[PDB]
Amino acid sequence: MTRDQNGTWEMESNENFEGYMKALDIDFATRKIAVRLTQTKVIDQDGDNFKTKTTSTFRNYDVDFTVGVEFDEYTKSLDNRHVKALVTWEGDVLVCVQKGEKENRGWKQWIEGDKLYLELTCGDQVCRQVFKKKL
Ligand SMILES: CCCCC/C=C\C/C=C\CCCCCCCC(=O)OC(CO)CO
């Protein structure tokens, strides 16, 4: 019973964000700034309805979805691609498949203890992020 991801979450680790960005074809100059940043994630969740904001000093990215309902996602100001996205529950893990021109693109997000874990995948690259809840 850990599906409730509501809150504001502050990044404490970001493993292989470089490789994930390179797999998305983010240019070197953009990666050079992006890899340095602490990200914050704000999740406003009402059951299966999610409104999410991921923020930093350099880029912000909002994505809203209902679990089980495919949607068009445009990764504006990130890699600027259009995908068909579907978020599902696997147990209490939120699983997103982003179908489009990059193979094996998606993410998984879940709560463990007082941490929010986010694993971002593109191709053969996995980025593992951990966030600590803000009080
Ligand atoms: C927004 C801050 C970025 C800081 C770096 C800036 C520029 C580097 C460009 C591209 C990298 C791709 C990043 C992908 C991040 C997706 C975040 C996402 O979709 O999370 C899901 C799960 O939480 C949303 O519900």
Numbering used by the authors: 0 to 134
Text lifted from the article:
Present in the small intestine, cellular retinol binding protein 2 (CRBP2) plays an important role in the uptake, transport, and metabolism of dietary retinoids. All CRBPs share the same protein structure architecture. Access to the binding pocket is governed by a “portal region” composed of conformationally flexible loops connecting neighboring β-strands.
Despite the two-carbon difference in length, the aliphatic ends of the fatty acid chains for each of these ligands are located exactly in the same place. This spatial length compensation is achieved by the adoption of a more extended configuration by the C18 chains of 2-LG and 2-OG as compared with 2-AG. The main difference is seen in the location of carbon atoms 3–6 of the chains, whereas the portions of the fatty acid moieties that make contact with the portal region of the protein are very similar in these ligands. Thus, the conservation of the interactions of lipids with the portal region seems to be key to the stabilization of the protein configuration in the ligand bound (close) state that macroscopically can be observed as lower Kd. The acyl chains of 2-AG, 2-LG, or 2-OG bent inside the binding pocket making contact with the side chains of the β5-β6 loop, α-helices I and II, and finally the β3-β4 loop at the ends of the carbon chains. In contrast to the lengths of the fatty acid moieties, comparing the positions of MAGs with polyunsaturated and monounsaturated acyls did not indicate differences in the spatial orientation of the ligands in the binding site.
